[PDB]
Every structure is written in C-alpha cells, then in structure tokens.
Amino acid sequence: MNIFRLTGDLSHLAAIIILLLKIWKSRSCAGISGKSQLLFALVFTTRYLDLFTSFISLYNTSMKLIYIACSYATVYLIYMKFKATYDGNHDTFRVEFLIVPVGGLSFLVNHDFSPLEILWTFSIYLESVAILPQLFMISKTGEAETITTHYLFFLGLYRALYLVNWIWRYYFEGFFDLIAVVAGVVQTVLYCDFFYLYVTKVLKGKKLS
Amino acid sequence: AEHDEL
Ligand SMILES: CCCCCCCC/C=C\CCCCCCCC(=O)OC[C@H](O)CO
Ligand SMILES: CCCCCCCC/C=C\CCCCCCCC(=O)OC[C@H](O)CO
Ligand SMILES: CCCCCCCC/C=C\CCCCCCCC(=O)OC[C@H](O)CO
Ligand SMILES: CCCCCCCC/C=C\CCCCCCCC(=O)OC[C@H](O)CO
Ligand SMILES: CCCCCCCC/C=C\CCCCCCCC(=O)OC[C@H](O)CO
C-alpha cells in the first residue's frame, strides 16, 4: 500500500459518490449512460468473486462491498426508479462489440486457464472500455453538465494514479502485472481528449463542446 | 495468483 493507490481508490470512490448523489438529489439521470453503469457493475461482479476465496484486509473487503453496492444502486436509479429521465434514444452504443471480444480475449490471454482467473481478466479488459458508451453519448448529445465532467475527471484520474502505483510497486517490491498495466494504459489513453477539454474549458468556466 | 488491489 502506497499513497498513489490510496489516492487512486479515494478518487474512484469520489467519482462513484458524485454520480450517485447527483442522480439521487436531482431525481433525474439525464445525460447519463446507463450502458456504462451496467458495464461497471459487471466489472465489480466478475472481479470481486475472490471475496469468497481470499481475505487481504478489512479495507480491501469493505471497498469491494461498497463498490458493488454503489454500482448496483446506480443501475437501479437509472433503469428502475428514475427511468422516466433515462435518455435511451441517445445512449445507443452497441455494447456487444465490447462484451463479446473482451470475453474472447480473457479466455485466450490470461495468467491462468481457470474460471476465477478468466473472470478476473474479463473485468480488467472490460473496465478499459467501460466508459466508451458515456463518452459516445456526450459526443452525440453535444455538451456535458459540469457535475458529469467532475465524475469523469475523478474516474479518469483513478486508473492514472494506479499506473503510478504500479511503477512504485515494481521499483520497491518487484511486483509486476502486465495484464493490469496494458489495460490500465488503454483505460487512461481513452480519457486524453476529455482531460484536455476539462483543463482548457471546464476548469476555465466554459462548457464542454 | 493473489490479487491484492481493487
Ligand atoms: C499522490 C496523489 C496525487 C494526487 C494529486 C491530485 C489530487 C487532487 C487534489 C489536489 C492537487 C491540487 C490540484 C492541482 C493539480 C495540479 C495542477 C497543475 O499542474 O498546475 C496548476 C497551475 O497550472 C499552476 O499555476
Ligand atoms: C489532504 C488531501 C489528501 C488527499 C490524499 C489522501 C491520502 C491519505 C490522506 C492523508 C495523508 C497522510 C496519511 C498518513 C498519516 C500518518 C499515518 C502514519 O503514521 O502511518 C504509519 C504507517 O505505518 C506508514 O506506513
Ligand atoms: C476520509 C479520508 C479521506 C477521503 C478523501 C477525502 C475527500 C473528501 C474531502 C473533501 C470534500 C470537499 C471537496 C468536494 C468533493 C470532491 C469532488 C468535487 O470537487 O466536486 C464534485 C461535487 O459533487 C460538486 O461538484
Ligand atoms: C469497437 C471495439 C473493438 C473491440 C474492443 C476490445 C477491447 C480490448 C481492450 C483492452 C485489452 C488490453 C490488453 C491487451 C492484452 C495484453 C495482455 C498481455 O500481454 O498478457 C500477457 C500474458 O501474461 C500472456 O499470457
Ligand atoms: C479501443 C482501445 C484503443 C486504445 C489503444 C491505445 C492504447 C494502447 C496501449 C498499450 C499498447 C500495448 C502493446 C503491448 C501489448 C502486448 C501484448 C502481447 O504481445 O502479449 C503477449 C501475449 O499475450 C502472449 O500470449
């Protein structure tokens, strides 16, 4: 454990609470991609099956349970409670172009050919591209609300901090995971345009696009 | 094959 991964985790929990409180207080999920939230719920579901086989720490167990609960609660608000404000007409990314190939690649390229390891790998590849339906909806609709841009900033910063965490762990404890690293680079690379626009427009009081 | 991160 280092400050880079702790800040990465805190930034990820911040993104999840920003979005959940935005929908809850405003009673509306307008502008939010439901498809991305189904993919992030699927990530925590396939990654944290080890909760039944391993205990790392109270913090690790608590963070897993919190991520699962908040992810399922966000999907519930979009598709059931506030479904009247869900913009289905603009959240049109065909998610089967992500799930089917990512499923194929997790079976072929993994550390071990076993159900739990394959499912863990699928969560790592799926998370790389999970935000694609939300960025696609913003490009289609045009703009993005300020609170939605803050959510995207803390979510994007989280895996960027994990890359710093992996440099630290490689240097100090000789630990290295090429699957998490490569996928984490792909994950961060997809935020490049958003980050440039967030810094040049949003942080200067201007609207996105 | 211990996975120690979230
Ligand atoms: C180790 C974990 C690192 C986490 C770090 C991010 C956490 C966000 C919070 C505070 C940083 C302050 C926000 C400013 C970030 C740098 C801005 C910058 O580079 O420059 C500002 C300006 O251009 C100069 O004149
Ligand atoms: C202010 C915004 C911060 C944003 C980033 C949040 C990172 C965690 C929070 C604070 C850093 C100080 C935490 C450490 C305080 C000292 C605790 C201590 O002595 O820990 C001993 C331990 O054994 C050593 O390995
Ligand atoms: C407990 C160990 C440390 C855990 C980490 C401490 C983070 C929370 C600290 C301060 C909140 C004040 C900053 C406001 C919240 C950050 C997100 C933000 O700036 O804005 C989004 C907000 O919903 C409107 O825009
Ligand atoms: C329109 C959408 C098109 C389809 C979208 C597909 C998304 C794939 C994303 C990320 C994969 C990133 C990881 C690439 C594989 C690197 C892993 C590696 O090298 O693993 C070595 C392992 O140890 C040997 O067994
Ligand atoms: C849709 C996503 C688009 C984002 C695209 C930009 C980001 C590319 C990032 C890193 C490239 C990684 C290249 C190195 C991967 C090596 C994989 C490899 O050869 O692994 C050995 C194999 O797994 C033995 O079985």
Residue numbers in the entry:
A (entry chain A): 1 to 209
B (entry chain B): 3 to 8
Quoted from the paper:
The selective capture and retrieval of ER luminal proteins is controlled by the KDEL receptor (KDELR), which recognizes a specific ER-retrieval signal sequence (ERS) Lys-Asp-Glu-Leu (KDEL) at the C terminus of cargo proteins. Crystal structures of the chicken KDELR revealed a seven transmembrane (TM) spanning integral membrane protein with structural homology to the PQ-loop superfamily of membrane transporters. In the mildly acidic environment of the Golgi, KDEL-containing ER luminal proteins bind the receptor with high affinity, which elicits a signal for the integration of receptor-cargo complexes into COPI vesicles. In contrast, the neutral pH of the ER results in cargo release and the subsequent relocation of the empty receptor back to the Golgi, resetting the retrieval cycle.
Crystals of the KDELR bound to the TAEHDEL peptide were grown at pH 7.0 using the lipidic cubic phase method and diffracted X-rays to 2.6Å. However, in the structure determined at pH 7.0, only one of the two water molecules (W2) is visible in the electron density maps. For structures at acidic pH, the water molecule at pH 7.0 coordinates interactions between His12, Tyr67 and Tyr162 on TM2 and TM6, respectively, and Asp9 on TM1 and does not interact with the carboxy-terminus of the TAEHDEL peptide. The loss of the W1 water molecule in the pH 7.0 structure thus collapses the hydrogen bond interaction network observed under acidic conditions, with the carboxy-terminus of the TAEHDEL peptide now only interacting with Arg47 and Arg159. Therefore, HIE is the most likely state at pH 7.
